[PDB]
Amino acid sequence: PQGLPNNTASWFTALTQHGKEDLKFPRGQGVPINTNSSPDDQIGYYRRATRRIRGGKMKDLSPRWYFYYLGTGPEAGLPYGANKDGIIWVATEGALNTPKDHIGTRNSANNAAIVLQLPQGTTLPKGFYAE
């Protein structure tokens, strides 16, 4: 079996925002589970992406937050903690403040995104689901 391609460069599926609350995590939480990574790699950001369709004006759909490792993706040039709307920062204890060159971005045409999982007990804002 093969699913439809996800043309985003994030290595993980998005966290869909079903309510009015933006995505945010308490300090030390939010980094997606990746068994092929070390404690040093557990740092990055989520970026809000929005699909837009016409209805007759151009309305938007439920916002989706995609995780990118530190120093990679659409905000590769932003240092950790940099303020920008739609960008929220996450880091597990013990992570290094260095760009994750070795992990990088996903090639959407040949690699499937990993289902975003978070450790049990992770606090999520209202309208978000770990599923």
JSON list of C-alpha atoms in Angstrom, two decimals:
[
{"chain": "A", "resi": 1, "resn": "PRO", "atom": "CA", "xyz": [0.00, 0.00, 0.00]},
{"chain": "A", "resi": 2, "resn": "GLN", "atom": "CA", "xyz": [1.00, 3.55, -0.78]},
{"chain": "A", "resi": 3, "resn": "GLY", "atom": "CA", "xyz": [-0.58, 6.81, 0.43]},
{"chain": "A", "resi": 4, "resn": "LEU", "atom": "CA", "xyz": [-0.83, 10.26, -1.19]},
{"chain": "A", "resi": 5, "resn": "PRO", "atom": "CA", "xyz": [2.38, 12.29, -1.06]},
{"chain": "A", "resi": 6, "resn": "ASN", "atom": "CA", "xyz": [2.72, 15.04, 1.55]},
{"chain": "A", "resi": 7, "resn": "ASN", "atom": "CA", "xyz": [4.64, 17.78, -0.37]},
{"chain": "A", "resi": 8, "resn": "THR", "atom": "CA", "xyz": [5.97, 19.45, 2.79]},
{"chain": "A", "resi": 9, "resn": "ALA", "atom": "CA", "xyz": [9.68, 19.11, 3.75]},
{"chain": "A", "resi": 10, "resn": "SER", "atom": "CA", "xyz": [9.00, 18.22, 7.38]},
{"chain": "A", "resi": 11, "resn": "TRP", "atom": "CA", "xyz": [10.08, 14.75, 8.44]},
{"chain": "A", "resi": 12, "resn": "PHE", "atom": "CA", "xyz": [6.84, 14.41, 10.46]},
{"chain": "A", "resi": 13, "resn": "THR", "atom": "CA", "xyz": [3.09, 14.70, 9.97]},
{"chain": "A", "resi": 14, "resn": "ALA", "atom": "CA", "xyz": [1.45, 17.97, 11.16]},
{"chain": "A", "resi": 15, "resn": "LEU", "atom": "CA", "xyz": [-0.31, 18.71, 14.48]},
{"chain": "A", "resi": 16, "resn": "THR", "atom": "CA", "xyz": [-3.70, 20.02, 13.31]},
{"chain": "A", "resi": 17, "resn": "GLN", "atom": "CA", "xyz": [-5.14, 22.99, 15.25]},
{"chain": "A", "resi": 18, "resn": "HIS", "atom": "CA", "xyz": [-8.86, 22.29, 15.79]},
{"chain": "A", "resi": 19, "resn": "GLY", "atom": "CA", "xyz": [-9.52, 25.20, 18.18]},
{"chain": "A", "resi": 20, "resn": "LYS", "atom": "CA", "xyz": [-8.66, 28.88, 18.76]},
{"chain": "A", "resi": 21, "resn": "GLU", "atom": "CA", "xyz": [-5.46, 28.09, 20.72]},
{"chain": "A", "resi": 22, "resn": "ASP", "atom": "CA", "xyz": [-2.13, 28.31, 18.90]},
{"chain": "A", "resi": 23, "resn": "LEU", "atom": "CA", "xyz": [0.39, 25.51, 19.38]},
{"chain": "A", "resi": 24, "resn": "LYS", "atom": "CA", "xyz": [2.80, 25.88, 22.34]},
{"chain": "A", "resi": 25, "resn": "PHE", "atom": "CA", "xyz": [4.62, 23.52, 24.69]},
{"chain": "A", "resi": 26, "resn": "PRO", "atom": "CA", "xyz": [5.95, 23.83, 28.26]},
{"chain": "A", "resi": 27, "resn": "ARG", "atom": "CA", "xyz": [9.80, 24.04, 28.42]},
{"chain": "A", "resi": 28, "resn": "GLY", "atom": "CA", "xyz": [11.25, 20.57, 27.82]},
{"chain": "A", "resi": 29, "resn": "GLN", "atom": "CA", "xyz": [8.28, 19.23, 25.80]},
{"chain": "A", "resi": 30, "resn": "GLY", "atom": "CA", "xyz": [7.11, 19.12, 22.16]},
{"chain": "A", "resi": 31, "resn": "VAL", "atom": "CA", "xyz": [9.96, 17.39, 20.28]},
{"chain": "A", "resi": 32, "resn": "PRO", "atom": "CA", "xyz": [8.56, 14.58, 18.08]},
{"chain": "A", "resi": 33, "resn": "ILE", "atom": "CA", "xyz": [9.78, 11.05, 18.87]},
{"chain": "A", "resi": 34, "resn": "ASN", "atom": "CA", "xyz": [12.62, 9.96, 16.57]},
{"chain": "A", "resi": 35, "resn": "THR", "atom": "CA", "xyz": [14.29, 6.68, 17.53]},
{"chain": "A", "resi": 36, "resn": "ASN", "atom": "CA", "xyz": [17.10, 7.33, 15.01]},
{"chain": "A", "resi": 37, "resn": "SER", "atom": "CA", "xyz": [18.45, 10.44, 16.80]},
{"chain": "A", "resi": 38, "resn": "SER", "atom": "CA", "xyz": [20.56, 11.30, 19.87]},
{"chain": "A", "resi": 39, "resn": "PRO", "atom": "CA", "xyz": [19.68, 13.56, 22.89]},
{"chain": "A", "resi": 40, "resn": "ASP", "atom": "CA", "xyz": [21.71, 16.35, 21.16]},
{"chain": "A", "resi": 41, "resn": "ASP", "atom": "CA", "xyz": [19.29, 16.46, 18.19]},
{"chain": "A", "resi": 42, "resn": "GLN", "atom": "CA", "xyz": [16.11, 17.04, 20.29]},
{"chain": "A", "resi": 43, "resn": "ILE", "atom": "CA", "xyz": [15.56, 20.73, 19.42]},
{"chain": "A", "resi": 44, "resn": "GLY", "atom": "CA", "xyz": [13.66, 22.65, 16.75]},
{"chain": "A", "resi": 45, "resn": "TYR", "atom": "CA", "xyz": [10.50, 24.57, 15.93]},
{"chain": "A", "resi": 46, "resn": "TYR", "atom": "CA", "xyz": [6.92, 24.21, 14.68]},
{"chain": "A", "resi": 47, "resn": "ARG", "atom": "CA", "xyz": [5.74, 26.39, 11.80]},
{"chain": "A", "resi": 48, "resn": "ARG", "atom": "CA", "xyz": [2.08, 27.14, 11.15]},
{"chain": "A", "resi": 49, "resn": "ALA", "atom": "CA", "xyz": [1.09, 26.32, 7.57]},
{"chain": "A", "resi": 50, "resn": "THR", "atom": "CA", "xyz": [-2.38, 27.06, 6.18]},
{"chain": "A", "resi": 51, "resn": "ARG", "atom": "CA", "xyz": [-4.15, 25.60, 3.12]},
{"chain": "A", "resi": 52, "resn": "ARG", "atom": "CA", "xyz": [-6.24, 28.15, 1.21]},
{"chain": "A", "resi": 53, "resn": "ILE", "atom": "CA", "xyz": [-9.30, 27.39, -0.95]},
{"chain": "A", "resi": 54, "resn": "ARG", "atom": "CA", "xyz": [-11.98, 29.56, -2.62]},
{"chain": "A", "resi": 55, "resn": "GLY", "atom": "CA", "xyz": [-15.65, 29.34, -1.53]},
{"chain": "A", "resi": 56, "resn": "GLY", "atom": "CA", "xyz": [-16.69, 33.50, -3.50]},
{"chain": "A", "resi": 57, "resn": "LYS", "atom": "CA", "xyz": [-13.60, 34.56, -1.47]},
{"chain": "A", "resi": 58, "resn": "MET", "atom": "CA", "xyz": [-10.30, 32.76, -0.62]},
{"chain": "A", "resi": 59, "resn": "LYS", "atom": "CA", "xyz": [-11.05, 31.23, 2.83]},
{"chain": "A", "resi": 60, "resn": "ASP", "atom": "CA", "xyz": [-8.48, 29.13, 4.76]},
{"chain": "A", "resi": 61, "resn": "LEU", "atom": "CA", "xyz": [-8.73, 25.58, 6.29]},
{"chain": "A", "resi": 62, "resn": "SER", "atom": "CA", "xyz": [-7.67, 24.25, 9.78]},
{"chain": "A", "resi": 63, "resn": "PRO", "atom": "CA", "xyz": [-4.09, 25.36, 10.49]},
{"chain": "A", "resi": 64, "resn": "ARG", "atom": "CA", "xyz": [-1.37, 22.68, 10.61]},
{"chain": "A", "resi": 65, "resn": "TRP", "atom": "CA", "xyz": [1.87, 22.95, 12.58]},
{"chain": "A", "resi": 66, "resn": "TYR", "atom": "CA", "xyz": [4.94, 21.23, 11.07]},
{"chain": "A", "resi": 67, "resn": "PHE", "atom": "CA", "xyz": [8.11, 20.41, 13.03]},
{"chain": "A", "resi": 68, "resn": "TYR", "atom": "CA", "xyz": [11.56, 21.17, 11.62]},
{"chain": "A", "resi": 69, "resn": "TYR", "atom": "CA", "xyz": [14.87, 20.48, 13.39]},
{"chain": "A", "resi": 70, "resn": "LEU", "atom": "CA", "xyz": [16.98, 23.45, 14.54]},
{"chain": "A", "resi": 71, "resn": "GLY", "atom": "CA", "xyz": [18.75, 25.14, 11.63]},
{"chain": "A", "resi": 72, "resn": "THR", "atom": "CA", "xyz": [16.66, 23.38, 8.94]},
{"chain": "A", "resi": 73, "resn": "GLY", "atom": "CA", "xyz": [13.55, 24.15, 6.87]},
{"chain": "A", "resi": 74, "resn": "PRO", "atom": "CA", "xyz": [11.67, 27.37, 6.14]},
{"chain": "A", "resi": 75, "resn": "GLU", "atom": "CA", "xyz": [13.22, 29.08, 9.19]},
{"chain": "A", "resi": 76, "resn": "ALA", "atom": "CA", "xyz": [16.68, 27.48, 8.90]},
{"chain": "A", "resi": 77, "resn": "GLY", "atom": "CA", "xyz": [18.25, 30.92, 9.37]},
{"chain": "A", "resi": 78, "resn": "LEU", "atom": "CA", "xyz": [16.49, 31.62, 12.69]},
{"chain": "A", "resi": 79, "resn": "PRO", "atom": "CA", "xyz": [18.38, 31.03, 15.95]},
{"chain": "A", "resi": 80, "resn": "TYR", "atom": "CA", "xyz": [16.54, 29.16, 18.76]},
{"chain": "A", "resi": 81, "resn": "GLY", "atom": "CA", "xyz": [14.01, 31.36, 20.55]},
{"chain": "A", "resi": 82, "resn": "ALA", "atom": "CA", "xyz": [13.77, 33.99, 17.76]},
{"chain": "A", "resi": 83, "resn": "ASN", "atom": "CA", "xyz": [10.36, 35.65, 17.81]},
{"chain": "A", "resi": 84, "resn": "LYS", "atom": "CA", "xyz": [8.32, 35.27, 14.61]},
{"chain": "A", "resi": 85, "resn": "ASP", "atom": "CA", "xyz": [4.55, 34.80, 14.24]},
{"chain": "A", "resi": 86, "resn": "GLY", "atom": "CA", "xyz": [3.62, 31.22, 13.44]},
{"chain": "A", "resi": 87, "resn": "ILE", "atom": "CA", "xyz": [6.94, 29.91, 14.83]},
{"chain": "A", "resi": 88, "resn": "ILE", "atom": "CA", "xyz": [7.08, 28.21, 18.24]},
{"chain": "A", "resi": 89, "resn": "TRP", "atom": "CA", "xyz": [10.24, 26.68, 19.73]},
{"chain": "A", "resi": 90, "resn": "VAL", "atom": "CA", "xyz": [10.66, 23.24, 21.33]},
{"chain": "A", "resi": 91, "resn": "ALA", "atom": "CA", "xyz": [13.66, 21.55, 23.00]},
{"chain": "A", "resi": 92, "resn": "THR", "atom": "CA", "xyz": [14.16, 18.44, 25.15]},
{"chain": "A", "resi": 93, "resn": "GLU", "atom": "CA", "xyz": [16.60, 18.70, 28.13]},
{"chain": "A", "resi": 94, "resn": "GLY", "atom": "CA", "xyz": [20.19, 17.98, 27.01]},
{"chain": "A", "resi": 95, "resn": "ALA", "atom": "CA", "xyz": [19.84, 19.11, 23.37]},
{"chain": "A", "resi": 96, "resn": "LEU", "atom": "CA", "xyz": [22.59, 21.11, 21.63]},
{"chain": "A", "resi": 97, "resn": "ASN", "atom": "CA", "xyz": [22.05, 24.57, 20.15]},
{"chain": "A", "resi": 98, "resn": "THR", "atom": "CA", "xyz": [23.59, 23.61, 16.72]},
{"chain": "A", "resi": 99, "resn": "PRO", "atom": "CA", "xyz": [21.98, 23.22, 13.22]},
{"chain": "A", "resi": 100, "resn": "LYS", "atom": "CA", "xyz": [20.93, 19.62, 12.52]},
{"chain": "A", "resi": 101, "resn": "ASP", "atom": "CA", "xyz": [22.75, 19.30, 9.15]},
{"chain": "A", "resi": 102, "resn": "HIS", "atom": "CA", "xyz": [22.86, 15.50, 9.40]},
{"chain": "A", "resi": 103, "resn": "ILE", "atom": "CA", "xyz": [19.05, 15.19, 9.71]},
{"chain": "A", "resi": 104, "resn": "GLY", "atom": "CA", "xyz": [18.00, 18.03, 7.36]},
{"chain": "A", "resi": 105, "resn": "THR", "atom": "CA", "xyz": [14.73, 18.20, 5.40]},
{"chain": "A", "resi": 106, "resn": "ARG", "atom": "CA", "xyz": [12.57, 15.44, 3.85]},
{"chain": "A", "resi": 107, "resn": "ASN", "atom": "CA", "xyz": [12.42, 14.70, 0.09]},
{"chain": "A", "resi": 108, "resn": "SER", "atom": "CA", "xyz": [8.62, 14.50, -0.25]},
{"chain": "A", "resi": 109, "resn": "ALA", "atom": "CA", "xyz": [8.59, 12.52, -3.55]},
{"chain": "A", "resi": 110, "resn": "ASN", "atom": "CA", "xyz": [10.55, 9.53, -2.18]},
{"chain": "A", "resi": 111, "resn": "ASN", "atom": "CA", "xyz": [10.22, 9.52, 1.61]},
{"chain": "A", "resi": 112, "resn": "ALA", "atom": "CA", "xyz": [7.03, 9.31, 3.64]},
{"chain": "A", "resi": 113, "resn": "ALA", "atom": "CA", "xyz": [6.64, 11.57, 6.67]},
{"chain": "A", "resi": 114, "resn": "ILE", "atom": "CA", "xyz": [6.88, 9.83, 10.05]},
{"chain": "A", "resi": 115, "resn": "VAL", "atom": "CA", "xyz": [3.65, 10.00, 12.13]},
{"chain": "A", "resi": 116, "resn": "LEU", "atom": "CA", "xyz": [4.23, 12.69, 14.77]},
{"chain": "A", "resi": 117, "resn": "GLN", "atom": "CA", "xyz": [4.24, 11.07, 18.20]},
{"chain": "A", "resi": 118, "resn": "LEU", "atom": "CA", "xyz": [4.88, 12.71, 21.55]},
{"chain": "A", "resi": 119, "resn": "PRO", "atom": "CA", "xyz": [5.79, 11.00, 24.84]},
{"chain": "A", "resi": 120, "resn": "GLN", "atom": "CA", "xyz": [2.86, 10.07, 27.14]},
{"chain": "A", "resi": 121, "resn": "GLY", "atom": "CA", "xyz": [1.90, 12.89, 29.48]},
{"chain": "A", "resi": 122, "resn": "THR", "atom": "CA", "xyz": [2.89, 15.63, 27.01]},
{"chain": "A", "resi": 123, "resn": "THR", "atom": "CA", "xyz": [0.76, 18.72, 27.61]},
{"chain": "A", "resi": 124, "resn": "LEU", "atom": "CA", "xyz": [-1.08, 19.96, 24.50]},
{"chain": "A", "resi": 125, "resn": "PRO", "atom": "CA", "xyz": [-3.20, 23.14, 24.21]},
{"chain": "A", "resi": 126, "resn": "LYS", "atom": "CA", "xyz": [-7.02, 22.88, 23.74]},
{"chain": "A", "resi": 127, "resn": "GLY", "atom": "CA", "xyz": [-7.91, 21.72, 20.23]},
{"chain": "A", "resi": 128, "resn": "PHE", "atom": "CA", "xyz": [-4.79, 19.57, 19.69]},
{"chain": "A", "resi": 129, "resn": "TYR", "atom": "CA", "xyz": [-4.48, 15.78, 19.71]},
{"chain": "A", "resi": 130, "resn": "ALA", "atom": "CA", "xyz": [-1.59, 13.36, 20.07]},
{"chain": "A", "resi": 131, "resn": "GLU", "atom": "CA", "xyz": [-4.10, 10.65, 18.77]}
]
